[PDB]
Every structure is written in structure tokens, then in C-alpha cells.
Design an enzyme around this catalytic site. Structure first.
Site, PDB file in Angstrom:
ATOM      1  N   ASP A   1      11.671  -2.714  -6.243  1.00 50.95           N
ATOM      2  CA  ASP A   1      10.426  -2.337  -5.593  1.00 50.95           C
ATOM      3  C   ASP A   1       9.234  -2.691  -6.479  1.00 50.95           C
ATOM      4  O   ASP A   1       9.381  -3.028  -7.654  1.00 50.95           O
ATOM      5  CB  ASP A   1      10.450  -0.841  -5.284  1.00 50.95           C
ATOM      6  CG  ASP A   1       9.667  -0.481  -4.042  1.00 50.95           C
ATOM      7  OD1 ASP A   1       8.926  -1.341  -3.522  1.00 50.95           O
ATOM      8  OD2 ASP A   1       9.808   0.670  -3.583  1.00 50.95           O
TER       9      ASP A   1
ATOM     10  N   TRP B   1       8.715  -8.543  -4.026  1.00 48.59           N
ATOM     11  CA  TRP B   1       7.658  -9.339  -4.653  1.00 48.59           C
ATOM     12  C   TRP B   1       6.619  -9.890  -3.670  1.00 48.59           C
ATOM     13  O   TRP B   1       5.417  -9.641  -3.883  1.00 48.59           O
ATOM     14  CB  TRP B   1       8.387 -10.425  -5.461  1.00 48.59           C
ATOM     15  CG  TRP B   1       7.569 -11.401  -6.234  1.00 48.59           C
ATOM     16  CD1 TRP B   1       6.210 -11.460  -6.351  1.00 48.59           C
ATOM     17  CD2 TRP B   1       8.084 -12.489  -7.002  1.00 48.59           C
ATOM     18  NE1 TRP B   1       5.852 -12.531  -7.139  1.00 48.59           N
ATOM     19  CE2 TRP B   1       6.986 -13.176  -7.553  1.00 48.59           C
ATOM     20  CE3 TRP B   1       9.379 -12.951  -7.276  1.00 48.59           C
ATOM     21  CZ2 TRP B   1       7.142 -14.302  -8.362  1.00 48.59           C
ATOM     22  CZ3 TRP B   1       9.533 -14.065  -8.078  1.00 48.59           C
ATOM     23  CH2 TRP B   1       8.422 -14.731  -8.612  1.00 48.59           C
ATOM     24  N   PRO B   2       6.983 -10.625  -2.610  1.00 49.82           N
ATOM     25  CA  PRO B   2       5.950 -11.190  -1.725  1.00 49.82           C
ATOM     26  C   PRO B   2       5.074 -10.146  -1.060  1.00 49.82           C
ATOM     27  O   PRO B   2       3.856 -10.340  -0.951  1.00 49.82           O
ATOM     28  CB  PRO B   2       6.755 -11.972  -0.674  1.00 49.82           C
ATOM     29  CG  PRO B   2       8.130 -12.078  -1.201  1.00 49.82           C
ATOM     30  CD  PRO B   2       8.342 -10.920  -2.115  1.00 49.82           C
ATOM     31  N   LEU B   3       5.679  -9.062  -0.579  1.00 49.65           N
ATOM     32  CA  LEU B   3       4.919  -7.999   0.064  1.00 49.65           C
ATOM     33  C   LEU B   3       3.814  -7.475  -0.843  1.00 49.65           C
ATOM     34  O   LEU B   3       2.688  -7.245  -0.391  1.00 49.65           O
ATOM     35  CB  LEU B   3       5.870  -6.873   0.468  1.00 49.65           C
ATOM     36  CG  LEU B   3       5.220  -5.595   0.982  1.00 49.65           C
ATOM     37  CD1 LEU B   3       4.344  -5.882   2.193  1.00 49.65           C
ATOM     38  CD2 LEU B   3       6.307  -4.596   1.317  1.00 49.65           C
ATOM     39  N   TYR B   4       4.112  -7.285  -2.127  1.00 51.00           N
ATOM     40  CA  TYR B   4       3.117  -6.735  -3.039  1.00 51.00           C
ATOM     41  C   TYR B   4       2.129  -7.789  -3.516  1.00 51.00           C
ATOM     42  O   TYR B   4       1.029  -7.440  -3.951  1.00 51.00           O
ATOM     43  CB  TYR B   4       3.811  -6.059  -4.227  1.00 51.00           C
ATOM     44  CG  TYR B   4       4.428  -4.723  -3.865  1.00 51.00           C
ATOM     45  CD1 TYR B   4       5.700  -4.657  -3.304  1.00 51.00           C
ATOM     46  CD2 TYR B   4       3.739  -3.530  -4.068  1.00 51.00           C
ATOM     47  CE1 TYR B   4       6.271  -3.444  -2.954  1.00 51.00           C
ATOM     48  CE2 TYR B   4       4.307  -2.303  -3.722  1.00 51.00           C
ATOM     49  CZ  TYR B   4       5.572  -2.268  -3.166  1.00 51.00           C
ATOM     50  OH  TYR B   4       6.146  -1.061  -2.828  1.00 51.00           O
TER      51      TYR B   4
ATOM     52  N   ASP C   1       6.717  -1.665   5.482  1.00 53.45           N
ATOM     53  CA  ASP C   1       7.925  -0.898   5.774  1.00 53.45           C
ATOM     54  C   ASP C   1       8.079  -0.652   7.268  1.00 53.45           C
ATOM     55  O   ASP C   1       7.121  -0.290   7.956  1.00 53.45           O
ATOM     56  CB  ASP C   1       7.886   0.456   5.060  1.00 53.45           C
ATOM     57  CG  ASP C   1       7.906   0.330   3.548  1.00 53.45           C
ATOM     58  OD1 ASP C   1       8.165  -0.776   3.024  1.00 53.45           O
ATOM     59  OD2 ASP C   1       7.664   1.359   2.883  1.00 53.45           O
TER      60      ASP C   1
HETATM   61  C1  LIG Z   1       6.409  -1.276   0.369  1.00 51.01           C
HETATM   62  N1  LIG Z   1       7.864  -1.049   0.306  1.00 51.01           N
HETATM   63  C2  LIG Z   1       8.016   0.374  -0.036  1.00 51.01           C
HETATM   64  C3  LIG Z   1       9.430   0.699  -0.494  1.00 51.01           C
HETATM   65  N2  LIG Z   1       9.374   1.924  -1.302  1.00 51.01           N
HETATM   66  C4  LIG Z   1      10.315   2.880  -0.716  1.00 51.01           C
HETATM   67  C5  LIG Z   1      11.058   3.589  -1.833  1.00 51.01           C
HETATM   68  O1  LIG Z   1      10.252   4.664  -2.337  1.00 51.01           O
HETATM   69  C6  LIG Z   1      11.255   2.051   0.112  1.00 51.01           C
HETATM   70  O2  LIG Z   1      12.207   1.405  -0.750  1.00 51.01           O
HETATM   71  C7  LIG Z   1      10.317   1.030   0.683  1.00 51.01           C
HETATM   72  O3  LIG Z   1      11.028  -0.128   1.105  1.00 51.01           O
END
Ligand SMILES: CNC[C@H]1N[C@H](CO)[C@H](O)[C@@H]1O
Ligand SMILES: *[C@@H]1O[C@H](CO)[C@@H](O[C@@H]2O[C@H](CO)[C@@H](O[C@@H]3O[C@H](CO)[C@@H](O)[C@H](O[C@H]4O[C@H](CO)[C@@H](O)[C@H](O)[C@@H]4O)[C@@H]3O)[C@H](O)[C@H]2NC(C)=O)[C@H](O)[C@H]1NC(C)=O
Ligand SMILES: *[C@@H]1O[C@H](CO)[C@@H](O[C@@H]2O[C@H](CO)[C@@H](O[C@@H]3O[C@H](CO)[C@@H](O)[C@H](O[C@H]4O[C@H](CO)[C@@H](O)[C@H](O)[C@@H]4O)[C@@H]3O)[C@H](O)[C@H]2NC(C)=O)[C@H](O)[C@H]1NC(C)=O
Ligand SMILES: *[C@@H]1O[C@H](CO)[C@@H](O[C@@H]2O[C@H](CO)[C@@H](O)[C@H](O)[C@H]2NC(C)=O)[C@H](O)[C@H]1NC(C)=O
Ligand SMILES: *[C@@H]1O[C@H](CO)[C@@H](O[C@@H]2O[C@H](CO)[C@@H](O)[C@H](O)[C@H]2NC(C)=O)[C@H](O)[C@H]1NC(C)=O
Ligand SMILES: *[C@@H]1O[C@H](CO)[C@@H](O)[C@H](O)[C@H]1NC(C)=O
Ligand SMILES: *[C@@H]1O[C@H](CO)[C@@H](O)[C@H](O)[C@H]1NC(C)=O
Ligand SMILES: CNC[C@H]1N[C@H](CO)[C@H](O)[C@@H]1O
Lengths: 392, 390
Positions: free
Chosen positions: B139, B173-176, B200
Site C-alpha cells: 500500500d 503505486w500508480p493509484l498514489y 477503492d
Molecule cells: C487507496 N487504497 C487503499 C488501501 N488501503 C486499505 C488498507 O488500509 C486497503 O488495502 C485499500 O486497498
């Protein structure tokens, strides 16, 4: 409306949400608005238990009319799609023990663009009575003034009365007032058996949430207006269609019971799951909706993505609905003192609590000082009935 | 990621969406994040046909950690909720023929606030390998720079490689990255077996639609980089929970197959309907998702509240999904020339078409001249498999 009708919320079936204005009987024959659709729907209302459950009005919505009136200025059913005519359809419906609802518009045209009733209120009312119509949904498209809107609604109410036939009168008057001025619900109730307050439902959980949120936001203004003879109409039941999960269907059924809503299914009774059918035919929930006291329920509490609604019933009983509005995770625990429910009356000195939705379970005797704990599914509702008692 | 793993999209179960960060084992013993929960899910994955259908990775998400590390600086599982330790849990999972996935975070803390792996990448990789971990979801919370994000993801990839143990590496990685700069998916694919691109998922039709719309919006950037060893991750399957109608669950299953998505169920295997189970275990649809060729599908057409997606498969075959996005009314008719499908080769000179969803039915032979007509339920999907006659 003091016509002796709708002493409890009207129950039936209305084609609009599921079938809308489908005129293409050549390429979509099973979906098009035709007399055969309504005949088959009536047959199934009888044979599949819908009439026994209380669904009595088989209602045509928009797009039944010929594009223009006849030589004597009377409305005509479409000659291709309704060749045998409304009066034969009404005789067929009545022969099944059912009642027939029809659709017209206060303005110059129906919302789909078919002949309006402005300038023909008395003709159209007597026409419907001659045909044997038992209910009229009166829409509000194509009306140039709020004065014409109100005049037409009151005028049609009076004309229907003049026929001497008992005709349930369903109005969209309030909804077509909202962009300009707030409705005077005392007057509307004077003229209408029920009235649409909010935007058209569609086949989505979003639509259910928005209807609920606007009802609760406005409940100070509409809840006490409703009662025997005149009801708030939050629009059709869409259980049995495609866009609601099982728990969202439970929520709609439960809350339409809480709201003393007319129960007009808009689905296809030829293609409906056993679960949806058992929910829509649930006699305990229907009994709540149809409760003879006829006091509309309301939202009691809201917070932490929970809602508590309740409805006073005959005989010091109450219906209580808990909604989980968190759309992630699992069932969430909710605890409340039973003394907070039913204005502190339901469980004084005790109440017996029966859970009806999502499953029926007797929960037992709860003393006035006790606490009720439940777990509510995401987007679901727990519906309880509390019966006041002096026993243990 | 060229580690020999995820040659087809990873299939398994992951607790996050359905069970989240529930630490209240006193009041919610059956729902709290604990070793008992994962033991029960492994048992059911064997006994209820999930493993046989291909669901192999039983994955722990966030909130398994003790609040602090050990003397030698190594992560610890919560002593109350995981009393026997991760290694013995992994032993049990392996004895069922399953694999175990765990969770950690590239930054200073996990998203729920437990120990991050920044400064401990090699330690944590070796610890997971020692425990017998088979998959790591990594994450991106609590990371103060894009350079630290990229460096941390790459470093943890390398550390895992160095342990010698085959470990599926799942990256957020890409999402963040996305809010601040466009990801370089060539690099991400070099370091990760799959990668989360978008926000999510939750238990709603709205989130399914959002995921599909953002995937098709970005398809020129992400579709071609996917393939054996490296997949786009549109997040967990939520079939079997509470917010999706039957037709919306069909849409998720069909489109996750079209997209060559990892299939990580997040549900309660102890309480799941027979219909949701038969959909999730649908052999023909899983076979499309698991197609060895590993070419991600794409949206072909969009219009009139319809969508057409398609996916090339091994051996001249194609999958085609048609979505009705109109949320009112009844089943709506959609017609398309089969010559428009599969880039013009799927049905040249002809193809046999089999509907798989919402129900399986052979439709027959369609010539290159033919038009395919279907009625598609509001918010539902019709999924077809086309086989070239040649
Ligand atoms: C932006 N992704 C957020 C991630 N953090 C959460 C765990 O606290 C879940 O794993 C979710 O997929
Ligand atoms: C046209 O409009 C007129 C009035 O505008 C309307 O008549 C009114 O409504 C009903 C007719 O059914 C009358 O109400 C009844 O009044 C008697 C008086 O003794 C009562 O006994 C009746 O009580 C029974 O029915 C009620 C259900 O409505 C129950 O609540 C009750 O327990 C009993 O079962 C009933 O209240 C009302 O008095 C008249 N008002 C007038 C005439 O001024 C007429 O029905 C309309 N016609 C059509 C065709 O719509
Ligand atoms: C650490 O990283 C290194 C380098 O990235 C990585 O080494 C790679 O391992 C994979 C698999 O372990 C190798 O992939 C093989 O490639 C050769 C071609 O030279 C093939 O012969 C192999 O064939 C497999 O696939 C067949 C079907 O095509 C199957 O029958 C069977 O499974 C075969 O084994 C396989 O594709 C890759 O070549 C190396 N790369 C290098 C540069 O060495 C290593 O695995 C990583 N270690 C860990 C623990 O992650
Ligand atoms: C239906 O249309 C007619 C004709 O356009 C409307 O009659 C007009 O009404 C406006 C104000 O309401 C007057 O200024 C015009 O002089 C009227 N014209 C005629 C020929 O009478 C009628 O009001 C419309 N009906 C509704 C319900 O909107
Ligand atoms: C995206 O990342 C890839 C991989 O890191 C880069 O591709 C490399 O580019 C170098 C030049 O710096 C070449 O020598 C290599 O052959 C490429 N492949 C690898 C595996 O390193 C690419 O330059 C990056 N693109 C952008 C726009 O940043
Ligand atoms: C609403 O209409 C009724 C009936 O015409 C009337 O008695 C009442 O005073 C009206 N209320 C308002 C606020 O105008
Ligand atoms: C973690 O915190 C330290 C101290 O505040 C900081 O220097 C470091 O950059 C942080 N790491 C990340 C990945 O944010
Ligand atoms: C704002 N209300 C719109 C009404 N018009 C439609 C008929 O065309 C349906 O009856 C609907 O209920």
C-alpha cells in the site's frame, strides 16, 4: 379527497417504470404498450397471488391514446395497439375481479405528447366513467400557468365526481408546482386521493436514496397531511426489476410501508424472481402499509450512516425501520433503548417485538427499560413490529 | 514482473472490502480480523469448490499487525488476534493446498495506522519469506514524496526477489502517483505483478461504473502493458455481498474477465448465496479471465447508453461483452455487425457464438455478413464467446 376511496393506500400495478412509452410493437412486441400486455398482466395478477395480496388496480400510464381525438372530440385508444378499446379492456379487467386505472394530462398534451385534457375535462371524465375506468393518474405536462394547473386539477376532480362513478384520483400537482412555489397540501388533499411529491423513480438504489432523503428532509411539511383518503406518493415500487440488490429491495418495501405509500408495482409479472414475489406479497409488511389508523411514519433518527424510521399503527403498535446507509463492509450493529421508540408508548410497560424483514423472527418481550440490538446489512433495512403489552 | 508468477491473473480472496479493519473480537468475534477468520475461509475455499475453480491465494489485508515491531526490528502479528503467528497460519493454508497473501505499506504507516515498511524494506521482505508468505499487497499511505514512493516500491520488489522465495507482488503505486504525475507503466510492470490504478471499490453499482469508466477513459495508456506477469488491478470482486443486484454482479464478473483482472473475492464464504457462488465459480467465464494469451480486453464502442467491450483469446477466439447502462425500463435491444467484432477476423468467414452470461446458451453460426442482436438488462451485461469456424 372525500370520495370514500383510498381509505388505505391504493395497491396495484402501473406500467410506466418498466415499460415506459414503447410504441414499437413490431420489433419489441413483448415490451410495447398494448392491450395484450395489460390482459396478460391481469391474468397473472389473478393467478400468481397478486390480487389476493391486495394489488387490485391494473393501471395504464402514458402512451395509450390515439394521436388525436375522434369526431365528437372524445379521446381514443390507439387503434393499432388497443384495437378492442378501453371499455372492452375494462370489462376484461373487471371480470378478473380487478379494477382499471388510466392516464391523462391536465395540460395541452400528455408528457409523451398525446392529447391533453385541457378544454375537455368533463368530456374526458364522463368518457372514462362510460368506459368503466376505476382510477385516473393525472399528469401535469404542457400547462402554461400554475393557475391553469390548479384549476385543471380541481376541475377534473369535480368532473370525475359529477360522473357518479367511484374513480380514484392520483395527481402530480405538487411536483409540477415545486420550481415556482411550495405546495399547499391541504388544498391538494381536498382534491386528490394521492399526490406525487418528488422526481420520477428509476431502477436504481440512487433513486431510492434520493426519494428517502427528500421525504425525510421535508417530513415536517408532508407527513401530517397524509391520512385515509389522501396519501403522499413517493412513486412506484421497482422491486422485481434489475437495479436493486435484495437488501435494497427490502429497503424499498419496508420504507414504503413506513411511509403509508400507495403500492404500485412497476415490473413484469411474467418475469419475476421468487424472492421478489415473496417480498412484494409479504402479508405482514402489506398489513403495516395498509394499517387502518393511516398515520404516515417518519424518520426518527439519522447519523453515523444509520437511519431510524418509525410508523404508529392501530392499537398502540409501532413499525420500526433501521437502515444501514454505509455502502462498504458488513452488517453493522445498532442498539437503541426501546423507550426511545414509539414516542415511549410502544413498550410501556412492555412490547413484544417481531422482526419482519429481512427475515421474520420473533425477538421476544422487551420491558420499557430494555435495549434492542440489531445488525443491519449495508444498504439494507431491518423492519420490526412492536406490540404494546402488559405480559412479561 | 518476470518472477514466473501471475502468468494468468491471480485468483483468490482478500478480506478488506467485506471485513475492513474490525478489531472488536470481544463484541464481533466472527467478523474481526483474526487468524480464526482466515482459517475458516481457507477451510471453505477447499470444501466449497473455490480452490477447484482456481481461487488459490488467501490474502490478509491491513490491520493484522501488532502496534509495534520486535526487538530485532521485525514486524509482528497482533498477539491477541493472531496468537499462533503468521508462519503457522501459512503452514495451515499451505496444508490446504492454498497460498497466503499479506499486506504492508511503502510509507511510514499503513493506511489504518500500523507500522509502515519505510526503512525496513529488506527486513520485511526477508521476514515475509521466512513466514512462508506467497503474496504481498503493498500500500501507499504515509509516503511524503513521489521519489520515496517509486524508490520504495522498486526496493521492495528487489528485496522480495533477493529472498529467493516466489512472492506475488501487488502494488498500489500508480493509484498514489496519478494525482501528481502520470505513471510510467513500463517501469511499474517491470517491478510489479499487478497494480491498482483507481480508487477503492465498495459495495455499490456506482463504484463498478466508476471503475469501468476510468478504465475505458485510460485504455490507450494501460491496456497494452498488461500481460502474463503483470496485470491492471481494478480491485476486488464484491459479488456475494449486499449492494449489487444480480445483473450488476454479472456485469462485474463479465468485465473483470474481459479486463484480465486479478479475481480477488472480498465476501463472506460462510454466508454466500448459491447464485453468487455459481457466478463466481463459472468455469467458462473464469476460463476467459485465465486465458493463457493474457491480452487485456478493451472498450470497442460506447453510445446510446450501451457499451461494447471485447477481448482477444487464444486460438482465434474472442470474448464480447455488451453493457446496458440505461437504469430505467426493461431489456434493451442492441445490434452489431459481427464483422465489426474482433477487429474483423473473429467471424471471417464465420464464427460460432455462445452466450455465457447472464445464462449460457449456444446462439449458432454467424457469417461474416451477419448481425448479432441481443436484449441486455438494465445495468446487466451479455457476455459472448466467439469461435472462428476455420
Ligand atoms: C487507496 N487504497 C487503499 C488501501 N488501503 C486499505 C488498507 O488500509 C486497503 O488495502 C485499500 O486497498
Ligand atoms: C362526490 O363528492 C361528495 C362530496 O364532495 C362525496 O360525498 C362525500 O363522501 C362520502 C361519500 O361516501 C360521505 O362520507 C360518509 O358520510 C356518512 C355520514 O353519515 C358516514 O356515515 C360515512 O362513514 C362510513 O364511511 C367512511 C369512509 O369514507 C368511514 O370512515 C366510516 O367509518 C363509515 O364506514 C362516510 O363518512 C361524505 O359525507 C360525503 N359528503 C357530502 C355528500 O357532502 C361523494 O361520494 C362524491 N362522489 C363520487 C362519485 O366520487
Ligand atoms: C528475480 O528476478 C529474476 C530476473 O528478473 C527472475 O529470473 C527470471 O525467472 C523467470 C522464472 O523463474 C524466468 O522465466 C523463464 O524464462 C526462460 C527463458 O530463458 C523459460 O525457459 C522459462 O519457461 C517457463 O515457462 C514455460 C512456459 O513457457 C513453462 O513450461 C515453465 O514454467 C518454464 O519454467 C521461464 O519463462 C526468467 O528467464 C528469469 N530471468 C532472468 C534474467 O534470469 C527470478 O525468478 C526472480 N526471483 C524471485 C525469487 O522472484
Ligand atoms: C393550451 O394552448 C392554448 C393556446 O396556445 C392556451 O391558450 C392560451 O392561453 C394563454 C395564457 O394561458 C393566453 O394568453 C392565450 O390568449 C390563449 N390562447 C388561446 C387561443 O386561447 C392554453 O392556455 C393552453 N393550456 C394550458 C393548460 O397550458
Ligand atoms: C519508462 O520506464 C521505462 C523502463 O524503466 C523506460 O524504458 C527504458 O528507457 C531506457 C532509456 O533511459 C532504455 O535504455 C531502456 O531500454 C528502456 N527499458 C528499460 C527496461 O529500462 C522509459 O524510458 C520510461 N519512459 C518515460 C517516458 O519515462
Ligand atoms: C391552503 O388551502 C386551504 C384550502 O383552500 C386554505 O384553507 C388554507 O388557508 C391554505 N393555506 C395557505 C397557507 O395558503
Ligand atoms: C518517514 O518519516 C521521516 C521522518 O519524518 C521522513 O524523513 C521520511 O521521509 C518519511 N518517509 C516517507 C516514505 O514518507
Ligand atoms: C414528473 N412525472 C412524470 C410522469 N410522466 C410520465 C408519463 O409520460 C409518467 O407518468 C411520470 O410519472
Amino acid at each position: 379527497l372525500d370520495n370514500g376511496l383510498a381509505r388505505t393506500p391504493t395497491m396495484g400495478w402501473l406500467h410506466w417504470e418498466r415499460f415506459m412509452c414503447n410504441l414499437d410493437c413490431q420489433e419489441e412486441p413483448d415490451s410495447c404498450i398494448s392491450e395484450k400486455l395489460f390482459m396478460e398482466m391481469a391474468e397473472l395478477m389473478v393467478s400468481e397471488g397478486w390480487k389476493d395480496a391486495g394489488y387490485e388496480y391494473l393501471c395504464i400510464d402514458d402512451c395509450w391514446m390515439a394521436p388525436q381525438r375522434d369526431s365528437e372530440g372524445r379521446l381514443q385508444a390507439d387503434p393499432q395497439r388497443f384495437p378492442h378499446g378501453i371499455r372492452q379492456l375494462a370489462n376484461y379487467v373487471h371480470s378478473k375481479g380487478l379494477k382499471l386505472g388510466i392516464y391523462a394530462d391536465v395540460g395541452n398534451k400528455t408528457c409523451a405528447g398525446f392529447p391533453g385534457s385541457f378544454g375537455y375535462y368533463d368530456i374526458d371524465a364522463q368518457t372514462f366513467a362510460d368506459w368503466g375506468v376505476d382510477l385516473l393518474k393525472f399528469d401535469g405536462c404542457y400547462c402554461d400557468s400554475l393557475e391553469n394547473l390548479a384549476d385543471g386539477y380541481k376541475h377534473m376532480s369535480l368532473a370525475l365526481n359529477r360522473t357518479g362513478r367511484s374513480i380514484v384520483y392520483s395527481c402530480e400537482w405538487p411536483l409540477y408546482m415545486w420550481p415556482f412555489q411550495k405546495p399547499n397540501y391541504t388544498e391538494i388533499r381536498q382534491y386528490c386521493n394521492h399526490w406525487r411529491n418528488f422526481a420520477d423513480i428509476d431502477d436504481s438504489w440512487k433513486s431510492i436514496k434520493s426519494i428517502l432523503d427528500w421525504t425525510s428532509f421535508n417530513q415536517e411539511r408532508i407527513v401530517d397531511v397524509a391520512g385515509p383518503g389522501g396519501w403522499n406518493d413517493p412513486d412506484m415500487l421497482v422491486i422485481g426489476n434489475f437495479g436493486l440488490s435484495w437488501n435494497q429491495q427490502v429497503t424499498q418495501m419496508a420504507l414504503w410501508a413506513i411511509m403509508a405509500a400507495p403500492l404500485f408495482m412497476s415490473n413484469d409479472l411474467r418475469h419475476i424472481s421468487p424472492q421478489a414475489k415473496a417480498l412484494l406479497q409479504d402479508k405482514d409488511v402489506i398489513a403495516i402499509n395498509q394499517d387502518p389508523l393511516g398515520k404516515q411514519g417518519y424518520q426518527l433518527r439519522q447519523g453515523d450512516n444509520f437511519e431510524v424510521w418509525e410508523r404508529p399503527l392501530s392499537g398502540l403498535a409501532w413499525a420500526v425501520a433501521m437502515i444501514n446507509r454505509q455502502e462498504i463492509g458488513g452488517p453493522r450493529s445498532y442498539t437503541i433503548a426501546v423507550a426511545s421508540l414509539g414516542k415511549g408508548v410502544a413498550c410501556n410497560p412492555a412490547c413484544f417485538i417481531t422482526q419482519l424483514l429481512p427475515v421474520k423472527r420473533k425477538l421476544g418481550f422487551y420491558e420499557w427499560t430494555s435495549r434492542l440490538r440489531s445488525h443491519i446489512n449495508p444498504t439494507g433495512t431491518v423492519l420490526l413490529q412492536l406490540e404494546n403489552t402488559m405480559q412479561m
